[PDB]
Design an enzyme around this catalytic site. Sequence first.
Site, PDB file in Angstrom:
ATOM      1  N   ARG B  72     -13.214   7.980 -14.733  1.00  0.00           N
ATOM      2  CA  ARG B  72     -11.903   7.623 -14.203  1.00  0.00           C
ATOM      3  C   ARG B  72     -11.284   6.624 -15.172  1.00  0.00           C
ATOM      4  O   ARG B  72     -11.553   5.425 -15.107  1.00  0.00           O
ATOM      5  CB  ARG B  72     -12.047   6.991 -12.816  1.00  0.00           C
ATOM      6  N   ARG B  94     -11.369  -3.658  -7.288  1.00  0.00           N
ATOM      7  CA  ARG B  94     -12.556  -2.872  -7.613  1.00  0.00           C
ATOM      8  C   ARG B  94     -12.887  -2.034  -6.396  1.00  0.00           C
ATOM      9  O   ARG B  94     -12.240  -2.170  -5.363  1.00  0.00           O
ATOM     10  CB  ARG B  94     -13.738  -3.791  -7.937  1.00  0.00           C
ATOM     11  N   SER B  95     -13.888  -1.170  -6.508  1.00  0.00           N
ATOM     12  CA  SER B  95     -14.263  -0.334  -5.374  1.00  0.00           C
ATOM     13  C   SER B  95     -14.734  -1.162  -4.187  1.00  0.00           C
ATOM     14  O   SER B  95     -15.633  -1.995  -4.316  1.00  0.00           O
ATOM     15  CB  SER B  95     -15.374   0.645  -5.758  1.00  0.00           C
ATOM     16  N   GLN B 102     -10.177  -6.188 -11.493  1.00  0.00           N
ATOM     17  CA  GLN B 102     -10.656  -4.929 -12.063  1.00  0.00           C
ATOM     18  C   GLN B 102     -10.791  -5.068 -13.583  1.00  0.00           C
ATOM     19  O   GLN B 102      -9.797  -5.218 -14.288  1.00  0.00           O
ATOM     20  CB  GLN B 102      -9.677  -3.797 -11.721  1.00  0.00           C
ATOM     21  N   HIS B 166       1.247   0.858  21.716  1.00  0.00           N
ATOM     22  CA  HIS B 166       1.758   1.212  20.399  1.00  0.00           C
ATOM     23  C   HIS B 166       0.682   2.031  19.708  1.00  0.00           C
ATOM     24  O   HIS B 166      -0.431   1.561  19.498  1.00  0.00           O
ATOM     25  CB  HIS B 166       2.088  -0.020  19.558  1.00  0.00           C
ATOM     26  N   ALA B 249       2.895  -8.043  13.920  1.00  0.00           N
ATOM     27  CA  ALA B 249       3.756  -7.200  13.098  1.00  0.00           C
ATOM     28  C   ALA B 249       4.997  -7.915  12.569  1.00  0.00           C
ATOM     29  O   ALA B 249       5.149  -8.083  11.358  1.00  0.00           O
ATOM     30  CB  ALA B 249       4.157  -5.954  13.881  1.00  0.00           C
ATOM     31  N   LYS B 278       8.757  -5.190   7.866  1.00  0.00           N
ATOM     32  CA  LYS B 278       9.510  -5.790   8.964  1.00  0.00           C
ATOM     33  C   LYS B 278       9.790  -7.246   8.663  1.00  0.00           C
ATOM     34  O   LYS B 278      10.649  -7.857   9.291  1.00  0.00           O
ATOM     35  CB  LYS B 278       8.730  -5.714  10.282  1.00  0.00           C
ATOM     36  N   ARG B 307     -10.796   2.194  -4.237  1.00  0.00           N
ATOM     37  CA  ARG B 307      -9.752   1.534  -4.980  1.00  0.00           C
ATOM     38  C   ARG B 307      -8.416   1.958  -4.410  1.00  0.00           C
ATOM     39  O   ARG B 307      -8.231   3.120  -4.069  1.00  0.00           O
ATOM     40  CB  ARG B 307      -9.896   1.921  -6.446  1.00  0.00           C
TER      41      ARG B 307
HETATM   42  C1  LIG Z   1     -14.268   8.311  -7.981  1.00  0.00           C
HETATM   43  C2  LIG Z   1     -15.230   8.705  -6.859  1.00  0.00           C
HETATM   44  C3  LIG Z   1     -14.865   8.519  -5.530  1.00  0.00           C
HETATM   45  C4  LIG Z   1     -13.470   8.080  -5.073  1.00  0.00           C
HETATM   46  O1  LIG Z   1     -13.308   6.660  -5.058  1.00  0.00           O
HETATM   47  P1  LIG Z   1     -11.951   6.009  -4.481  1.00  0.00           P
HETATM   48  O2  LIG Z   1     -11.848   4.533  -5.113  1.00  0.00           O
HETATM   49  O3  LIG Z   1     -11.921   5.990  -3.001  1.00  0.00           O
HETATM   50  O4  LIG Z   1     -10.728   6.852  -5.102  1.00  0.00           O
HETATM   51  C5  LIG Z   1     -15.792   8.849  -4.548  1.00  0.00           C
HETATM   52  N1  LIG Z   1     -16.979   9.341  -4.852  1.00  0.00           N
HETATM   53  C6  LIG Z   1     -17.352   9.546  -6.124  1.00  0.00           C
HETATM   54  C7  LIG Z   1     -18.725  10.149  -6.424  1.00  0.00           C
HETATM   55  C8  LIG Z   1     -16.482   9.227  -7.161  1.00  0.00           C
HETATM   56  O5  LIG Z   1     -16.853   9.418  -8.455  1.00  0.00           O
HETATM   57  C1  LIG Z   2       5.685  -1.702  13.674  1.00  0.00           C
HETATM   58  C2  LIG Z   2       4.492  -2.133  14.530  1.00  0.00           C
HETATM   59  C3  LIG Z   2       3.197  -1.969  14.055  1.00  0.00           C
HETATM   60  C4  LIG Z   2       2.860  -1.538  12.626  1.00  0.00           C
HETATM   61  O1  LIG Z   2       2.697  -0.125  12.483  1.00  0.00           O
HETATM   62  P1  LIG Z   2       2.300   0.456  11.035  1.00  0.00           P
HETATM   63  O2  LIG Z   2       2.865   1.961  10.968  1.00  0.00           O
HETATM   64  O3  LIG Z   2       0.845   0.377  10.777  1.00  0.00           O
HETATM   65  O4  LIG Z   2       3.145  -0.390   9.959  1.00  0.00           O
HETATM   66  C5  LIG Z   2       2.143  -2.341  14.883  1.00  0.00           C
HETATM   67  N1  LIG Z   2       2.354  -2.852  16.083  1.00  0.00           N
HETATM   68  C6  LIG Z   2       3.593  -3.036  16.559  1.00  0.00           C
HETATM   69  C7  LIG Z   2       3.793  -3.650  17.946  1.00  0.00           C
HETATM   70  C8  LIG Z   2       4.696  -2.678  15.792  1.00  0.00           C
HETATM   71  O5  LIG Z   2       5.956  -2.879  16.265  1.00  0.00           O
END
Ligand SMILES: *Cc1c(COP(=O)(O)O)cnc(C)c1O
Ligand SMILES: *Cc1c(COP(=O)(O)O)cnc(C)c1O
Lengths: 434, 434, 434, 434
Positions: B72, B94-95, B102, B166, B249, B278, B307
């Site tokens: 990557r 980082r992961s 990073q 919600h 929120a 918001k 990541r």
């Molecule tokens: C790159 C990779 C991932 C994905 O990692 P993210 O940071 O979530 O994008 C998962 N598993 C393997 C084996 C990888 O090489």
């Molecule tokens: C807007 C709001 C959220 C946040 O929702 P996301 O889609 O994750 O941004 C959570 N709780 C309440 C009460 C909200 O009004």
Amino acid sequence: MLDFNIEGLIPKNMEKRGELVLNEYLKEIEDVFNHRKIPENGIDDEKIKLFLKFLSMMDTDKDPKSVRIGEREARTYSKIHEELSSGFCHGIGRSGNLVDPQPKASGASIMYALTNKILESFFKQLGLNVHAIATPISTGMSISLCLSAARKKYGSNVVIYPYASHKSPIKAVSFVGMNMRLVETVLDGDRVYVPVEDIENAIKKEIELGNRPCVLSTLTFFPPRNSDDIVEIAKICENYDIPHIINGAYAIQNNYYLEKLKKAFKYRVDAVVSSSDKNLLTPIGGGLVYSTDAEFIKEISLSYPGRASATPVVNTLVSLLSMGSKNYLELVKNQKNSKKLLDELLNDLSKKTGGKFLDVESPIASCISVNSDPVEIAAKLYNLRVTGPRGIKKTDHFGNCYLGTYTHDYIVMNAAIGVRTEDIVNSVSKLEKI
Amino acid sequence: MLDFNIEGLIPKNMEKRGELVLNEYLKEIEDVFNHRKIPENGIDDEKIKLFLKFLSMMDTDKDPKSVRIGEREARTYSKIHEELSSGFCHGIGRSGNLVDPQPKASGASIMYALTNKILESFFKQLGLNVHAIATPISTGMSISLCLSAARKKYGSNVVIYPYASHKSPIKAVSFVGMNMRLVETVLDGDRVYVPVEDIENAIKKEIELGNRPCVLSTLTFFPPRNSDDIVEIAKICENYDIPHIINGAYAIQNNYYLEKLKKAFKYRVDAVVSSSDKNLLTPIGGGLVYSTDAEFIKEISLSYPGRASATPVVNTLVSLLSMGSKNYLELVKNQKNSKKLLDELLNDLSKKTGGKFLDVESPIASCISVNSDPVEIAAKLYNLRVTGPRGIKKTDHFGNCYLGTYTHDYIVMNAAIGVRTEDIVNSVSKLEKI
Amino acid sequence: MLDFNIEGLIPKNMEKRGELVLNEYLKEIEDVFNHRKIPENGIDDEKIKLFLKFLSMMDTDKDPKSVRIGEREARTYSKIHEELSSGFCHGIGRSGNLVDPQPKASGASIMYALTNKILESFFKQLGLNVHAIATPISTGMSISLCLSAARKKYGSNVVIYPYASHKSPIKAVSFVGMNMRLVETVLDGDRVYVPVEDIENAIKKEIELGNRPCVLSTLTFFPPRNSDDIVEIAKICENYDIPHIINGAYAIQNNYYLEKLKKAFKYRVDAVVSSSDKNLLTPIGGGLVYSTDAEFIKEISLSYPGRASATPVVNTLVSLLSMGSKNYLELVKNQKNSKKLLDELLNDLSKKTGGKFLDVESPIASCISVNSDPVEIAAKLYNLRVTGPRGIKKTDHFGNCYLGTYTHDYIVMNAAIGVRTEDIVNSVSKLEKI
Amino acid sequence: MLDFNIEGLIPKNMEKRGELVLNEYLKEIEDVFNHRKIPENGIDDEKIKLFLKFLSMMDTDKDPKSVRIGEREARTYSKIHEELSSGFCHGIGRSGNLVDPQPKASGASIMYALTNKILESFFKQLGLNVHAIATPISTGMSISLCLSAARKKYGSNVVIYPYASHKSPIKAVSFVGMNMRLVETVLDGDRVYVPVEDIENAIKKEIELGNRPCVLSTLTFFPPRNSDDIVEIAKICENYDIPHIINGAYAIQNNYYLEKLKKAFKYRVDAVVSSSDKNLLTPIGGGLVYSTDAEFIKEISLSYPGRASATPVVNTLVSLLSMGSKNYLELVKNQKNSKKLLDELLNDLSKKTGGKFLDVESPIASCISVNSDPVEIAAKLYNLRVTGPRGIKKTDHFGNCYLGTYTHDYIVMNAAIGVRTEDIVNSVSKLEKI
Ligand SMILES: *Cc1c(COP(=O)(O)O)cnc(C)c1O
Ligand SMILES: *Cc1c(COP(=O)(O)O)cnc(C)c1O
Ligand SMILES: *Cc1c(COP(=O)(O)O)cnc(C)c1O
Ligand SMILES: *Cc1c(COP(=O)(O)O)cnc(C)c1O
């Protein structure tokens, strides 16, 4: 597609040519709307920005005549915001459902729907007839979504995990509060793999104890470890009627893995998860989830809590339209020759030093043995502009994906899709020097 | 800050005047690196882009003399990709560790570290000495992060949840696989709330079952619902040594909410989560996590598998820099007036019609009871380009955040930060024509 | 080159590497300032924009601490103004002096001084040791600037003009209010030309009349007409001590023309004018004036009434930096192959058409005589998406640059600097269908 | 306006909504095409770019299916090129005729035409019913265009020029190679003016010796000189049937000068020339030519040799669309308020020392006499961050626009349209500290 009052300014002949020219230029954009397939030839950036713009203008927060008194009207302060969100300030999807059209968006919803159509089209170009979805989160976070879907649709309460030591998938399993049941790997020469026999027993054990297991197979991992027997595991799961999810991090970039997926899809594969940056050359941040189970993909988009940033999804839609199928199959071809060069060159250095060009499965990465401390040789490379080389100690449990002691101290290098010859020739050069 | 061979081209007095200018222009940029605080005056877009490009050029992949042979290496296909990521193709962290620099980035690491210090600075200005982290995911997903952090830090395995209807936060609990002990609301004439005596009660119950309860309170929600007694809940959790997470929120944009928080932190509050859009007017898809316990934030940043995208975090940095402290206070002052204007107008509308200007706690939204179908009235309003007004039935449990029969059929409107005077007048006017 | 505080955020090793990346990334820009020559390799758009930003930030109007109480302070209204001028709102030079630095725009003056130095290095690498100036106007208007100069310095009041039928230069002469002595062309087989002998007799007849002659020759023109004997004319203009202005519209691109220039500068040549668009692939609007007389180039920059726009001069700089000396040579090299192809395809076409691949001097264009109306054929071509080819009757006097009757009806096509192998093959095949 | 296939992707009612928002968002753009007038309200930069994009796409070079083998295909090397030219890579106008549509670029031609009509509706709104044209060159070069037009259409061969000592117009008359008869200025108090009686005898005298006189009067000029009696000269020019051209560099911005032009058009005015930067807050480089005679505008258009850059003309267009008429009026009103602030402040500083507040005609500029060397003061102001002040000695003939000894050493400051209060207050207190 586009028509505006231009009369009385220029003579008819020039007026018609200007129109003929305007329509042809817009043709590539028009076909995306009409065919919704990955174009053969990559579309230029300016033309893609005009496409995204056409859709961004359909969102509610773009209406100059509306009285806005909602709780989340999606007001933004800087223009830089419109640049980064690509004009999709309302993000993507409705609360708790990604692939569901957002009444306040409309423009973002069409682009998301178009992006998945094109992704699916792209897969058909590669020989995989699946239902696909671009996810606005990492591949690891995407795995969580799958694990969570299986957990709500089939009731999974335990995950059988053919050992794959990567921080992401492991953290994804704990992130969703699911119990894990590892399946150690075994040594066999220079390789490491996970007997399908031990997985089947792990599955049986869990079922005997009253649990509802689901397997998280791993198709793409670092050289040492062999891609799991996706086909076999896929049969087992169908027989036991259990969910099977595949971590296909970078499976989309080359045939070796695509074929295994094709054959595994014959039986039971609930979902596959792939990185959008490793396979579609997108900046870090998004995932691709696909399967033959339309029902399961929907559940997957119902596991995500709240609304998300549209940016990662747009990045994918941008790789698809910008590259196109031709250029993609070409990057794949260049991959093959890059790998070979990487082998029939790294093997030469084996003659210089002690030697032993390890014999591993990876169609992307190679491994060479060395006496010095790997970690040090690695860091000595980090300090030479070389990025990506791995230095593992035979005593490095995690790095080898083998709990016992591994047979070598090595340096693995990759030939990922899009790798340039220089990355290869010169990475080996900076290597010989040590 | 910037220097290059300019000599032998222009007269000396111009050479000197010219340098003087370049320095004043950059003054705002370097002040960000030197002080790392939210500036009092918003910085213009071109300068912020230059600031972001400066950080961008420190990321490995931009090294014209680098060698990438990794699995990557963040190779992007289209320039559009760089725009959307703002030049942070590697992304953030980082992961499984968001706030950990990073090695392959650097510039992206700097930018994020700066965002967090500029975020904290911003909070200080408002009156809260807290530790904050800008998250690259929705507020609902940010709650999953906090929950998961509560799991590995204090072993919590059940969430006490004062009813807050919600989708996002509810799913957020389900995603991390934690049971939820719902604590219903009680009606009190015009207001709806959750008796604190019942929350502690639910706490004692789950503890008697052998579980380790965790509290997810809600400080900001729609009108009928009062804010949960955050301060009292915080005392309780201090006594039981139980974790407390607060869904806040839209707490930052308003002083009424900031006050309770200041008091609540006096006791136990492991984390507060806020929408970045918001409160900082960013596109949807970003989050703000803050707390007095630095140890909990570190845990929160280790809960995200993999990541993440850099974009939502950059949107938050663009807001703070582009906005500035001066303008933010101005925006807050205007909501106070816009609200009082809303109250009186609605009160005026009352009397002329069946009447009844609901008395609710919210500092941003107001309600007025109606003698007709609320859903049809809101519908007609939409038909007048008025976006945001909700029409709730006295029987809509999820709408009233009450599991019984509410005492009214009403319409709610919001004076959210950024609302225009015309919007309040051009809303209550149209409602009156109905 | 770039130093800003970055400490206390990222570990030392990443701090160091971060810088190595940043310096390397800017090295190319740094080299322009240090060397001030055409780069061996092309510099990418982002680096050039960055380079131009650095320069525009030195302009007085960008000073946040500026105080502007003049009638002309470059106050601009829209950001688009900045984009189109590239940050140079003051333009270039001063009233009546392009090369003289603007005390209100140190930055604009620097990029212009650099553009001219870089342009002169571009030339030296093509074998021309000259003083060059990038002009903010087209080649025709640029010729007016030259003629105006020849008058201020030598008192010229008449232009001996070897017949070249292009509306631009002829209108240039009348604009400068100078009478013209048109020296008719003579026929010789498939070729038309102005005999050096009748150009001299024209010159000596204007001196006899007591006028001060000036010669405007033409080195580049459409096939039908040979290039003027620049070397002989230079030999003559010198003996008679008379200014000599050369319209080298597209002489820069072809070495055939550069050689004639090299041999003609050994004599009398006050200036050569070339279109920035035809040789540097710049958008239409700029020019390039040059000669071995630094004195005459100075007077030319003092012939433009008032202050000029910066844009065309920046477009020329972008071309020089974007292409690089290397990429340019390939263009010149590829053009040799395109012309070879064109000729052998047209020749083969004549064997099976009715014959006659006309014998013309043009290094970029070749002609084929046809057995039917040329206008019609060129129209069938135009209708078939082919643009650029001209159809000319043996009667068209302006088109054959011959007042007599030309020996053929013909079609001529070009193989200019950026022509593609496909366009030539294609355009010829369609000519064949006709 | 915009129509593309979006069905089978979003619920129908949302589909309608997105289509309504889109259309409402494109109204302002739709109006520019249907109305072709300056909009009451300014249009945001983003929509202006889109508008320009719809036009650039019509130019013949943006045609993908085209086979390009012409002499001037308008090929571009860098994307920056297409950015600095706003997409119009073919420039504007046909060879030797600006306002005439270029068959190779319908887009540029459409835009140019719209710009001229929109420029004309801007004048009509200021009280002038004129035929106007935006030019791609300086006001001075634009004056040369008129002189040239006068020479061809009416046979003019000598310019009667009331002394206006500005290098630009002086260079314009010289450029066009016309004999200039200067009409000296006279001293009257703190004013300098050209007696009309002096002008008329000059005309008379030039007619006397067979010549055909043309009058180039100056309406806007530095403080000392009064504006030529444009109305009387116009009347006189009509009585003699002689062409009349007015230099109105910065007349459009102030009603004082517009009223004079209104009364002046009542008689004989062939054309007025004004600067687009000084009046339309455009970057330096463009002109505005206008007159009640449509026949004369065509002639001027036929005076430019060759093709020209589109950028200066796009800048004028952008200014008209970006400001709008409402804002333009607020700029005109702020300047009256800034002028009075300049005066009272300069009068105060008048008493602080010897100095006299000179009584000059200028509605935008004002002067204060000083005892020390004015040139040293103007230098000190420069060092102190001030651009625009003029320091003229009583003996500086060119700076006073008078061949005798003016009566004061003084400093000139301007309150041109767009000037900030800060520029005014700070420039005076800077003069005070001296
Ligand atoms: C790159 C990779 C991932 C994905 O990692 P993210 O940071 O979530 O994008 C998962 N598993 C393997 C084996 C990888 O090489
Ligand atoms: C807007 C709001 C959220 C946040 O929702 P996301 O889609 O994750 O941004 C959570 N709780 C309440 C009460 C909200 O009004
Ligand atoms: C292109 C060309 C010109 C210059 O045309 P402009 O529109 O002024 O740039 C002049 N003469 C010849 C022979 C040309 O080819
Ligand atoms: C500023 C000014 C000019 C100069 O205009 P250019 O655009 O530089 O040609 C000419 N005349 C007057 C009276 C001016 O004030």
